Design a protein around this ligand. Structure first.
Ligand SMILES: *Cc1c(COP(=O)(O)O)cnc(C)c1O
Ligand SMILES: *Cc1c(COP(=O)(O)O)cnc(C)c1O
Ligand SMILES: O=C(O)CCCC(=O)O
Ligand SMILES: O=C(O)CCCC(=O)O
Lengths: 396, 396
């Protein structure tokens, strides 16, 4: 069977981990995968998470199966983060959430759901976007098209090109939108633009699909949900996949959700039964630990208070880091002006380097970034900032 | 989109959980899902697991991503449980294991792997078998055929019918075998029969796929692996999916593995890269907690000692329970002779009731079992044994 099998090409993001382990040069700077690092260059487990785990340890009595859609309390809590306390969606019982294995698992289930229960044939992904998007939808059997988004020249959102290219999207097509902190550009639509996209969407007949992986990293929990919420108030149906890997620092515990929204409760229930069937045929039920931790935190006011301050701290460290990055670059006499970095939201720096420049960075300096020229700013520490900038200047 | 969607039919096993929550009659007896229960009718978290969790709590420093195939130490440990300490497979580096979300996740990944990287078009499943098998393979796009196995009349393995029906399996076909504790019959092949199937398999050109969900529940860890091992010594390629939900009582933490075996290390590596690609497009990486617990236990001699005694205890409680079950049935003046129950391995009782009899059991008595007439013996306690047997006698 396996005699003619070809070696699959390494993942453009995850492949960096393998490369790094083989490179024994001490001063390696990892700016690849989008995980948070503290001032010491370590990705630690939040204090709020440790405390919740303590609670679980002491009060957990069984590890019996969770139910296809997972921990009920967890779904309720995620809905409020996304839609808001007194959301009409929540109150009209138009939403159903399923706990999934990370944000990727959520995208996979929505894709399987779509592929087999609707007439959806294609999904529109921004150009550029997280690489795994195309892969997830294509493996489900869906065709993936791309719409204009970034403006490499001005480093902004080319709204006109976005709209003009999306006019090719027919009714019944899925249009994938990043809730906030657009991976990898860091450029998000203004609230005004979100409303325009919302009205255009309903008018054209698109099925919105939001990918929320960084809620809380742009401006704050609620502020970051404005885009989705503008879409929620006008749409009958929509799908939203979120992750808790980044904002809770629970990467390996695989915590995320897939939410379905329909015109009413009976439609959403009928649809949700098919989503559960797609899950039963994948992993059966989701992993409890990570979601249990998230439910425990959000549900307890004290733990929630500590968690929110931790999220605020992380965001604040990244914002200060990108400013310090641009400042140090000028001191090293960097060729180009990278001030646009400060306008980007999230953990990434994008639009400054070329593929060959990043290749030379790892080759000659041991600095690891994604081939598209995307650097994890959250991986920059006061200690490595200097030798890193020196590496960049020598490559410009 | 979701206007014409049909309601998916409830799962034949998992659907019991929903039914039970709506039935408010106090004396409900749950004998559906195959989860272990102690003398009090509770499914607790093992002491060995609690201790490992304590260790994790104290010594875990990060929750950063695990790597597509998961915790390396965990894969190594699972290979020894399955193949044995000095296995040639391990030493010739012909095996590669991927940590997956439970045993179902493992079956799903192997299915996606098969469907897209090999010429496999069909899988042979025993009649009967766990219901989710067909579903998992069909959703992957593979055709599912069935081979004779059980003998309802004599309550044994109809070996002749098995072989005779499997002769319809062409070379390049996948043949799914349950490692031990056949779900739901509880009838497994004798070691002699395993060797016959092994020789027949190689001669016919079948691709073996073992489902290991109850290793340690029939006779013991090693004894239960004899069947697979007889197949391993003669086969170049094979796939094995295992679960740790039952033998470690880590149901909701979703712990399992998918192992690939090829003629040599280079072939297995080439093949394994495609399996990783299939995972990246599903859930990206697996949940660390459950597997971390399993790695911690198996790796530490003291914890392993406690765990093995816990497994021995569980098995011993089920063996005593089925004997007490048959004994109490005769005292209640049961119509039929159910002594064959004692010959079955695992947590289940199968072959005594009809669909209508199980319907009447939940309807009139609140006793819940699977519609196929399969009862979870591990759910029987000294307290419920009597009213349960009374319910059965009144239905015979
Ligand atoms: C991180 C990320 C994901 C994946 O979420 P997981 O929890 O790691 O599976 C999905 N989409 C985007 C845009 C991401 O940044
Ligand atoms: C329990 C079981 C599974 C599922 O394993 P999970 O860890 O629950 O996903 C698979 N196959 C058989 C035969 C089982 O009994
Ligand atoms: O790729 C992933 O699965 C996680 C890191 C996210 C990113 O770097 O875009
Ligand atoms: O069905 C499942 O997913 C778990 C219980 C196993 C069984 O009852 O066969």
């Amino acid at each position: 069977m396996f005699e003619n099998i070809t070696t699959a090409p390494a993942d453009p993001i995850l492949g960096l981990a393998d490369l790094l382990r083989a490179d024994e040069r001490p001063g390696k700077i990892d700016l690849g995968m989008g995980v948070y690092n503290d001032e010491t260059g370590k990705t630690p487990v939040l204090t709020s998470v440790k405390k919740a785990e303590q609670y679980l340890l002491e009060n957990e009595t069984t590890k019996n199966y969770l139910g296809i859609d997972g921990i009920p309390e967890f779904g309720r809590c995620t809905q409020e983060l996304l839609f808001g306390k007194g959301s009409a969606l929540i109150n009209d019982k138009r939403a159903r959430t399923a706990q999934t294995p990370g944000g990727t698992g959520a995208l996979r289930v929505a894709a399987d759901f779509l592929a087999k229960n609707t007439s959806v044939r294609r999904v529109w992904v921004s150009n550029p976007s997280w690489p795994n998007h195309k892969s997830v939808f294509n493996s489900a059997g869906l065709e993936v098209r791309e719409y204009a988004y970034y403006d490499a020249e001005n480093h902004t959102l080319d709204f006109d090109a976005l709209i003009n290219s999306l006019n090719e999207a027919q009714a019944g097509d899925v249009v994938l939108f990043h809730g906030c902190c657009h991976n990898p550009t860091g450029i998000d639509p203004t609230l005004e633009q979100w409303q325009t996209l919302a009205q255009l969407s309903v008018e054209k007949g698109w099925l919105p699909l939001f990918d929320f992986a960084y809620q809380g990293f742009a401006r704050g929990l609620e502020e970051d949900a404005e885009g989705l919420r503008a879409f929620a108030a006008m749409h009958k149906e929509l799908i939203v996949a979120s992750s808790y890997s980044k904002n809770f620092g629970l990467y390996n515990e695989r915590v995320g959700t897939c939410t379905l929204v329909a015109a009413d409760s009976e439609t959403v229930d009928r649809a949700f039964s098919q989503m559960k069937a797609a899950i039963r045929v994948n992993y059966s039920s989701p992993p409890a630990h990570g979601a249990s931790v998230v439910a425990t935190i959000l549900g307890n006011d004290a733990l929630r208070a500590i968690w929110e301050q931790e999220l605020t701290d992380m965001r604040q460290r990244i914002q200060r880091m990108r400013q310090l990055f641009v400042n140090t670059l000028q001191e090293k006499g960097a060729n180009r002006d990278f001030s646009f970095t400060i306008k980007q939201n999230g953990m990434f720096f994008f639009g400054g380097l070329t593929k060959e420049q990043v290749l030379r960075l790892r080759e000659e300096f041991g600095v690891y970034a994604v081939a598209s020229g995307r650097l994890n700013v959250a991986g920059m520490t006061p200690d490595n900032l200097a030798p890193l900038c020196e590496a960049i200047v020598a490559v410009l």
